[PDB]
Amino acid sequence: IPIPRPITTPHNNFIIFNKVHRFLTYGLANVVIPITRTVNDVTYVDNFVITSLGRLPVDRPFLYMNPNEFAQLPPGSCIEECNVRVTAFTPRIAFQATLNQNQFILHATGLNIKTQGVDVRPKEFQANEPMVVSSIDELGADENLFEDYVKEKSVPNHVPRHQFGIPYPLKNYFALVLQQNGTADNPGYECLQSHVNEIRCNGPPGEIVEYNYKPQLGLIKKAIPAVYTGVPSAVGGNSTLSCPAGAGNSQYRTADFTMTNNLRGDSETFKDTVVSNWTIATQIEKSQILHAGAFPSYTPRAQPSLHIGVKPVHALTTANLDDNLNNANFTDTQAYFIVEAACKVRLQYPSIRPLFNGPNTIPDNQIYSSSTLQYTHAV
Amino acid sequence: IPIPRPITTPHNNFIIFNKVHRFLTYGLANVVIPITRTVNDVTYVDNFVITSLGRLPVDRPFLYMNPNEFAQLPPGSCIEECNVRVTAFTPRIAFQATLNQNQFILHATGLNIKTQGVDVRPKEFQANEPMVVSSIDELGADENLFEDYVKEKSVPNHVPRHQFGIPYPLKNYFALVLQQNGTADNPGYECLQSHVNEIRCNGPPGEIVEYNYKPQLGLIKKAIPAVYTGVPSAVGGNSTLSCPAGAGNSQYRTADFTMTNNLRGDSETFKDTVVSNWTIATQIEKSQILHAGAFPSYTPRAQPSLHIGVKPVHALTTANLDDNLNNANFTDTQAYFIVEAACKVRLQYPSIRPLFNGPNTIPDNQIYSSSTLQYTHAV
Amino acid sequence: IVEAACKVRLQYPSIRPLFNGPNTIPDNQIYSSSTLQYTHAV
């Protein structure tokens, strides 16, 4: 009368990575870099306004790991959590004619979605040091953008940034922008100051904010699929009833009229397993659905800055001219994650799962950047 | 100053049925019954693998009731609950040359959805007793399939199975299958053993599992509709606004590539009251919506078996040849349910309800079997 | 009361036994009550 036979399905796992970089921003001139947008009839010029603000590839994996020795071997793996903490200090002024002043320091957390302006603009300079004077559209560039950074390769003459624990400057600064040229019926800028924080860091202001994110669908590899059977030709296919109710269709839209919001479309497409992602936006949720679902997605983006030391004395009316500050911000991170060996059919390799398996995708694969125009998610 | 007038709308009710059948499985040869699938070019042959496993029309009403004296008079009635309990015993071996051995017994619960293989295959035999050697596709057959069973009619020469409390054999055995012929890039079978339970029932192993199910939408009759008015021609029709949001459209899909999952469509249709169900799948939820909704549905299916007594002695290499076992499984059931006299308009007959009334259906009526290829629901 | 007392599997739609439903007067008599009661319908 006893029972005998025991067996089972899965086998999950975890692991993390630790990294500590040294970066630096600079009291970038808080100015207007207007760019001439031209159609059949050139007008509506976008006036970008720079901010000393920086950006941390926090949303990108390389920031957290070994290049390859690390973006290595985790088939089907996802990163559930991760976080960082800047902890910077006192600004390195220089006079290449001011002396002393109150250097304020600052940072703000992924204001990216709630600030319409974007982090594009690593620009060009002038005869007055910190001086954005050309800003290049760091946008629509999406695995090459944050791709020079990747050097932390072939050229040994870029002392591996990390490993050797070497300082660094960031090349992407934030800014806000406005399309105002046609006539004068264009409102002002957003209350930037509102989303940010000043300090009068006497010395080493020590540690700043600790960023933390639990990416919704932090996938970062192809996922294992399943194995149908029961109604055959080489590659069978069955279609069964259900109660929707509008099964998700990678649905999205919006549109505007003269800087004023008004329009919203929707576009619908179909669901099929994804077959790809070296180091790309980990916040992989707006283009992924696992198995049929209903989700509207979002994302965050830390940044650190030293404000800016203005140098106006006994000089009156339409004046801005500034001072330099090199500041040693001190980030470091933790990338937590899943791992897997969920196998299914004895003979097949190397990983499987069921029918209610890995996330489905948009047939024609769409993928979205984030260095230009967020609203509530990657444009 | 007193109040006078009292009245009201509905009148609900309950009732159940009790039945006790005697069935029997047999230590069906645990073998491969390959079937030749042929297109313009015959290939990809499906290799079915039999299992002593049985099946209990648990999902079908007749199992629970009087034929007609019972599938009788419950207009609009539904069955909310129901359950059974096998409680079998010691296997009846015979030597038509083995003597004694350890007969293991077993059952498993509706593994149907989580086992890709189906319960088709009541087959044919050989010169070696328990010997599936032909399996017929008990599938796509849907009120005739479990229709011989119905005799428990005109022919008095089928001693009413029940009533007289007579034993019985089941004619539908489960199995798993795989489409593997073209070349050798086809994985193995599913870990069947994983979903099942062996016993070394010394004697009368007594009672086994008690199956229980509370069908989502256990309708089993036409339902009463309502009565519009207010904007007339003979049969008026009005169309009012709402906030969807994608009102359910009997939505469904999927498809595959070489035994590997990958595709999923969706197809949309409209909602209108159903006008029908003698004895058909009670688990009537994947084709029914009551009044506008959003549901993805599922189902379960008990089965009982006596494993199999293998007879290999002093015989070596590519050997299977087996022994017979007749086992007296002892099921019995309870079918609970609703009943109704919800009336509305005095003069109309014989039953009504409101505008938010009985379940709507697929215009062209689709209906789905379950003796072939489940995934997560009737194919 | 209400009922679903069934008996023989195959027959429909309701049954009961031999000691079953009320018997009646062969030629069916039926009595009014808007005229002359004594102790019951005239």
Chains that touch B (3 or more CB pairs under 8 A): A, C
**Phi and psi dihedrals of C12, rounded to 5?**
-140, 160
Pairwise CA distance, residues A12 & B25, whole Å: 39
A268 Cβ partners below 8 Å, 6+ apart? Answer: A249, A250, A251
Query: Is B12 in CB contact (< 8 Å) with chain C?
Result: no
Look at the alpha carbons of A261, A192, A372, A270 in this order and tell me if their dihedral is positive or negative.
negative
B-chain CB neighbours of C2 within 8 Å are 13
Look at the alpha carbons of A339, A343, A347, A348 in this order and tell me if their dihedral is positive or negative.
negative
Nearest Cα residue to B273 out of B228, B229, B230, B234: B228
Pairwise CA distance, residues A310 & A308, whole Å: 6
Rg (CA), chain C: 17
A328 Cβ partners below 8 Å, 6+ apart? Answer: A22, A24, A88, A89, A92, A167
**Tokens read off for A330:** 């001190």
CA distances from A125 to A131, A170, A310 (A): 5, 15, 17
Cβ neighbours, 10 Å, residue A265 = 9
Alpha-helix runs per DSSP H in chain B:
none
**Tokens read off for A5:** 């036979």
Pairwise CA distance, residues A37 & B181, whole Å: 62
A-chain CB neighbours of B196 within 8 Å are 5
**Phi and psi dihedrals of B193, rounded to 5?**
-45, -35
Pairwise CA distance, residues A377 & B207, whole Å: 58
**Phi and psi dihedrals of B192, rounded to 5?**
-35, -60
Rg (CA), chain B: 25
**Tokens read off for B65:** 């009731």
Q: How far is A362 from chain B (nearest CA, A)?
A: 11
The interface residues of chain B toward chain A in range 239-258, judged by CB-CB distance below 8 A, are 244-258
B-chain CB neighbours of C1 within 8 Å are none
Question: Cβ–Cβ of C15/B72 closer than 8 Å?
Answer: no
The angle at the Cα of B91, spanning B89 to B96, to the nearest 5 degrees, equals 160
Contact between residue B308 and residue B324 where contact means Cβ atoms under 8 Å apart: no
Chains that touch A (3 or more CB pairs under 8 A): B
Query: Is A359 in CB contact (< 8 Å) with chain B?
Result: no
Q: Say if residue B354 is preceded by a cis peptide, omega within 30 of 0.
A: no
Nearest Cα residue to A210 out of A320, A121, A88, A28: A88
CA distances from B270 to A48, A247, B239, B378 (A): 51, 15, 14, 20
Cβ neighbours, 10 Å, residue A95 = 9
Strand B333-335, strand A360-361: pairing = unpaired
Question: Cβ–Cβ of A356/B368 closer than 8 Å?
Answer: no
Pairwise CA distance, residues A77 & A75, whole Å: 5
The angle at the Cα of A223, spanning A219 to A227, to the nearest 5 degrees, equals 150
Q: How far is C20 from chain B (nearest CA, A)?
A: 17
CA distances from A92 to A24, A309, B198, B364 (A): 10, 11, 75, 76
Q: Which residues is B14 bridged to in the sheet?
A: B338
Question: Cβ–Cβ of C12/B153 closer than 8 Å?
Answer: no
Strands, E, within B224-340: which ranges? 255-257, 260-263, 272-273, 302-305, 309-310, 322-323, 325-327, 333-335, 338-340
Q: How far is B265 from chain A (nearest CA, A)?
A: 6
Query: Is B332 in CB contact (< 8 Å) with chain A?
Result: no
Cβ neighbours, 10 Å, residue B128 = 15
Instruction: Mutate one of B43, B137, B242, B264 to test the A interface: name it (highest A CB count within 10 A).
Output: B264
**Phi and psi dihedrals of A192, rounded to 5?**
-35, -60
Q: How far is C39 from chain B (nearest CA, A)?
A: 35
**Tokens read off for C6:** 């069934």
**Tokens read off for A29:** 């001139």
Largest alpha-carbon pair distance within chain A? 101
SS (H, E, C) chain A: CCCCCCCCCCCEEECCEEECCCECCECCCCCEEEECCCCCCCCCCEEEEECCCCCCCCCCHHHHCCCCCCCCCCCCCECCCEEEECCCCCEEECCCCCCCCCCCEEEEECCCCCCCCCCCCCCECCCCCCCCCECCCCCCCCCCHHHCCCCCCCCCCCCCCCCCCCCCCCCCCCEEEEECCCCCCCCCCCCHHHCCCCECCCCCCCCCCEEEECCCCCECCCCCCCECCCCCCCCCCCCCCCECCCCCCCCCCCEEECCEEEECCCCCCCCEECCCCCCCCCCCCCCCECCCCCCCCCCCCEEEECCCEECCCCCCCCCCCEECEEECECCCEEECCEEECCCCCCCCCCCCCCCCCCCEECCCCCCCCCCCCCCCCCC
Chain A residue with CA closest to B255: the answer is: A237
Query: Is A6 in CB contact (< 8 Å) with chain B?
Result: no
Please give the single-letter amino acid code of residue B49: V
CB-CB: which of B257, B286, B372 is closest to A242?
Answer: B286
CB-CB: which of B190, B286, B373 is closest to A238?
Answer: B373
Burial of A289 (0-12, 13-18, 19+ CB in 10 A): buried
Q: Which residues of B83-116 are buried (b: 16+ CB within 10 A; e: fewer)?
A: ebbbbbbbbebeeeeeeeeebbbbbbbbbbbbbb
Q: Helix (H, G, I), strand (E, B), or coil: what is residue B50?
A: strand
Q: How far is C5 from chain B (nearest CA, A)?
A: 9
Cβ neighbours, 10 Å, residue B5 = 4
Pairwise CA distance, residues A93 & A327, whole Å: 8
Complete DSSP assignment for B58-107: TSSGGGGS-STTTS-S-TT-B---EEEE-----EEE-----------BEE
Strands, E, within B117-275: which ranges? 175-179, 210-213, 255-257, 260-263, 272-273
A-chain CB neighbours of B37 within 8 Å are 232-233
Nearest Cα residue to A369 out of A206, A183, A173, A145: A145
Look at the alpha carbons of C33, C35, C41, C42 in this order and tell me if their dihedral is positive or negative.
negative
Q: Which residues of A2-29 are buried (b: 16+ CB within 10 A; e: fewer)?
A: eeeeeeeeeeeeeeebebebbbbbbbbb
CA distances from B295 to B216, B289, B290 (A): 10, 8, 11
Pairwise CA distance, residues A357 & A365, whole Å: 19
The structure was resolved to a resolution in Å of 3.5
Q: How far is A234 from chain B (nearest CA, A)?
A: 6
Query: Could you tell me the residue ranges of all domains in chain A?
Result: 13-354
Q: Helix (H, G, I), strand (E, B), or coil: what is residue B232?
A: coil
- Residues shown for chain A: 379
Q: Which residues of C12-26 are buried (b: 16+ CB within 10 A; e: fewer)?
A: beeeeeeeeeeeeee
Contact between residue A250 and residue B274 where contact means Cβ atoms under 8 Å apart: no
Pairwise CA distance, residues C12 & C8, whole Å: 8
Q: Which residues is A339 bridged to in the sheet?
A: A13
Nearest Cα residue to B294 out of B241, B255, B244, B362: B244
Question: Cβ–Cβ of B68/C15 closer than 8 Å?
Answer: no
